[PDB]
Amino acid sequence: PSNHYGPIPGIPVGTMWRFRVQVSESGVHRPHVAGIHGRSNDGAYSLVLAGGYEDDVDHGNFFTYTGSGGSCDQKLTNTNRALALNCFAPINDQEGAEAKDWRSGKPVRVVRNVKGGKNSKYAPAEGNRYDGIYKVVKYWPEKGKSGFLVWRYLLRRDDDEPGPWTKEGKDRIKKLGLTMQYPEGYLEALANAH
């Protein structure tokens, strides 16, 4: 169902799609534009890292992430609240929270998109790649570049499948024969567009 937590059966870490519409169709990240799929009364099921917030860092097994909204203070509502709920700590919309036992938190599927490349060496060079399950360690408010409050999150990887950029993850990609997926007819249309 749309509120599925965890990996999608049959879609291993390292899977690559050229376009977001394909990522949506796979169920790995259902929204075709929004960066985060979540329900404010439940949790977050997936997110896409595609750059945008300059203060964010991406170190592969861990990354920081900034919420949405705000012009004005962001609020811990909607998908900001969804992602917060995944953290293994009671929700706190004033100071945020940190999970000591963060691995007991709800999983988030993470896809990296090529747009993230200026500030991340882990972004794929093309398209979108599924990088596995991550969990929210902590989240907190802070004064943004706008001068208004933004919600920030720290995520850490927790997946039994190795990271796609590691030697063991690259070996799996090879063994499974994963390749960049293009829509039916797309390469053919480009080839003929002359």
**Cβ-based neighbours of 159, under 8 Å, separated by 6 or more:** 7, 13, 132, 133, 134
| Residue 190 is assigned to a structural domain of this protein | yes
| Residue 186 is assigned to a structural domain of this protein | yes
Which H or E run contains 63?
A: strand 62-66
| Residue 6 is assigned to a structural domain of this protein | no
| Residue 188 is assigned to a structural domain of this protein | yes
**Cβ-based neighbours of 41, under 8 Å, separated by 6 or more:** none
Residue 122's domain is classified under what CATH number? Answer: 2.30.280.10
Question: How is residue 22 written in tokens?
Answer: 């394909």
CB atoms within 10 A of CB 73: 15
**For residues 126 and 7, what is the distance between their CA atoms, to the nearest angstrom?**
22
Query: Position 73: which residue type?
Result: D
Q: Give the rounded distance of the alpha carbon of 150 from its chain centre.
A: 18
* CB under 8 A, 24+ apart: contacts of 139-147: 139/83, 139/84, 139/87, 139/96, 139/97, 140/95, 140/96, 141/74, 141/94, 141/95, 141/96, 144/55, 144/66, 144/70, 144/74, 145/54, 145/55, 146/70, 146/71
Question: Which residues form the domain of 93?
Answer: 17-194
| Residue 166 is assigned to a structural domain of this protein | yes
| Residue 64 is assigned to a structural domain of this protein | yes
Question: How is residue 141 written in tokens?
Answer: 């408010």
Q: Using what technique was this structure determined?
A: X-ray
Question: How is residue 35 written in tokens?
Answer: 């960066």
Contact 30, 11 (CB under 8 A): no
Query: Position 9: which residue type?
Result: P
| Residue 7 is assigned to a structural domain of this protein | no
**Of 128, 126, 139, 154, residue with least CA distance to 61:** 154
**For residues 127 and 28, what is the distance between their CA atoms, to the nearest angstrom?**
14
| Residue 12 is assigned to a structural domain of this protein | no
* Helices marked H in the chain: 20-26, 78-86, 167-176, 186-192
User: Is 56 within any annotated ligand binding site?
Assistant: yes
DSSP 90-126: ---TTT-EE-TTGGGSPPEEEEEEGGGGGG-TTS-SS
Resolution in A: 1.7
**Of 43, 41, 23, residue with least CA distance to 33:** 23
User: Is 51 within any annotated ligand binding site?
Assistant: yes
**For residues 15 and 12, what is the distance between their CA atoms, to the nearest angstrom?**
6
CB atoms within 10 A of CB 108: 27
DSSP state, 58? B
Contact 163, 51 (CB under 8 A): no
**Of 150, 111, 89, 137, residue with least CA distance to 31:** 111
Give me the number of domains the chain comprises: 1
